[PDB]
Amino acid sequence: GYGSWEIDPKDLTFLKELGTGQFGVVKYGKWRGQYDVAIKMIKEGSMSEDEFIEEAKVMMNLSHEKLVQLYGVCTKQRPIFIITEYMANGCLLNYLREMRHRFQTQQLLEMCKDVCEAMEYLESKQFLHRDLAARNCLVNDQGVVKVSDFGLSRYVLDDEYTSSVGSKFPVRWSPPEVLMYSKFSSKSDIWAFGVLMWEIYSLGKMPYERFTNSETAEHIAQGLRLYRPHLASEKVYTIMYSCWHEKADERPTFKILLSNILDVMDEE
Ligand SMILES: Cc1cc(Nc2nn(C(C)C)c(=O)c3cc(N4CCN(C)CC4)ccc23)n[nH]1
């Protein structure tokens, strides 16, 4: 079985429906009567057994404070449950678009820092995310941003690349070598991170806000990039822009990006 990862359904309680997507309903509940959890009730026939086993392995091997944590699964009942850590402020993209937060740039840089820490860990484990974007990060009650949409959490979040069976490609988060040749690498994650920084500093604007995906691909083919968001200092823009070098091998690592971000944070 799944050992300690197999959660006893008797230890779950339900409080509120958070969402309903392609792979089923997500509810906010408690585990053991004390721990806040997001509970995904998997729609029967939305994923195969092998897919589940593969994606479970992914989440069970990876663990970091800035990665949305799997708590467990219930697999002896129908429907299947996936139990994850609860993130009270939900999706980062919607969070950024709420104008009432009136974010300081210090807050925005800390969001970047949180994600960069998670990505550095993934980098260290040789794990490629492949769909890093604000829509795929979650925010907890404390304003801490964490990366999700990996392994089983792809199904929890009703990932549109997964639910569209590859139809909806993240063009606006992709480097030229991906758009041209499907050449995925750590450096395609690095590129995505830069675009994410841009999303954060643009308070959740769609990247290439006046372009189609097709115009976007042409724009980057001309060596052109996203402008500096007004809220981003020149130093911050230098960091995000470094992620978009034409040559993949000229792009920084997440280790370097984290050091750059911290240096700017301490400089304020
Ligand atoms: C996996 C996981 C998901 C999760 N929490 C939430 N997930 N989702 C979907 C991604 C399922 C929401 O849509 C959502 C929305 C909110 N509202 C949104 C409205 N805002 C004003 C208050 C917070 C909170 C939490 C969530 N924690 N862990």
From Swiss-Prot:
The lineage of its organism: Eukaryota, Metazoa, Chordata, Craniata, Vertebrata. It comes from the Eukaryota. The chain holds residues 391 to 658 of 659 of the full protein. Changing Y161F: Loss of phosphorylation of GTF2I. Transmembrane segments: none annotated. Non-receptor tyrosine kinase indispensable for B lymphocyte development, differentiation and signaling. Binding of antigen to the B-cell antigen receptor (BCR) triggers signaling that ultimately leads to B-cell activation. After BCR engagement and activation at the plasma membrane, phosphorylates PLCG2 at several sites, igniting the downstream signaling pathway through calcium mobilization, followed by activation of the protein kinase C (PKC) family members. PLCG2 phosphorylation is performed in close cooperation with the adapter protein B-cell linker protein BLNK. It is found in: Cytoplasm; Cell membrane; Nucleus; Membrane raft. One of its GO terms (cellular component) is membrane raft. The active site is at D131. GO terms for biological process: adaptive immune response; apoptotic signaling pathway; B cell activation; B cell affinity maturation; B cell receptor signaling pathway; calcium-mediated signaling; cell maturation; cellular response to interleukin-7. This is Tyrosine-protein kinase BTK. It comes from Homo sapiens (Human). Belongs to the protein kinase superfamily. Tyr protein kinase family. TEC subfamily. Changing R251H: In XLA; severe. The keyword Protease does not apply. Predominantly expressed in B-lymphocytes. The modification Phosphotyrosine is found at Y161, Y227. Keywords: Acetylation, Adaptive immunity, Apoptosis, ATP-binding, Cell membrane, Cytoplasm, Disease variant, Dwarfism, Immunity, Innate immunity, Kinase, Lipid-binding, Membrane, Metal-binding, Nucleotide-binding, Nucleus, Phosphoprotein, SH2 domain, SH3 domain, Transcription, Transcription regulation, Transferase, Tyrosine-protein kinase, Zinc, Zinc-finger. Clofedanol binds at T84, E85, Y86, M87, L152. Part of a complex composed of EEIG1, TNFRSF11A/RANK, PLCG2, GAB2, TEC and BTK; complex formation increases in the presence of TNFSF11/RANKL. Binds GTF2I through the PH domain. Interacts with SH3BP5 via the SH3 domain. Interacts with IBTK via its PH domain. Interacts with ARID3A, CAV1, FASLG, PIN1, TLR8 and TLR9. Interacts with MPL/TPOR. A motif (CAV1-binding) lies at residues 191-198. GO terms for molecular function: ATP binding; identical protein binding; non-membrane spanning protein tyrosine kinase activity; phosphatidylinositol-3,4,5-trisphosphate binding; phospholipase activator activity; phospholipase binding; protein tyrosine kinase activity; zinc ion binding. The keyword Acetylation applies. The gene is BTK. Following B-cell receptor (BCR) engagement, translocates to the plasma membrane where it gets phosphorylated at Tyr-161 by LYN and SYK. It is linked to X-linked agammaglobulinemia: Humoral immunodeficiency disease which results in developmental defects in the maturation pathway of B-cells. Affected boys have normal levels of pre-B-cells in their bone marrow but virtually no circulating mature B-lymphocytes. This results in a lack of immunoglobulins of all classes and leads to recurrent bacterial infections like otitis, conjunctivitis, dermatitis, sinusitis in the first few years of life, or even some patients present overwhelming sepsis or meningitis, resulting in death in a few hours. Growth hormone deficiency, isolated, 3, with agammaglobulinemia: An X-linked recessive disorder characterized by growth hormone deficiency, short stature, delayed bone age, agammaglobulinemia with markedly reduced numbers of B cells, and good response to treatment with growth hormone. Residues 12-265 form the Protein kinase domain.
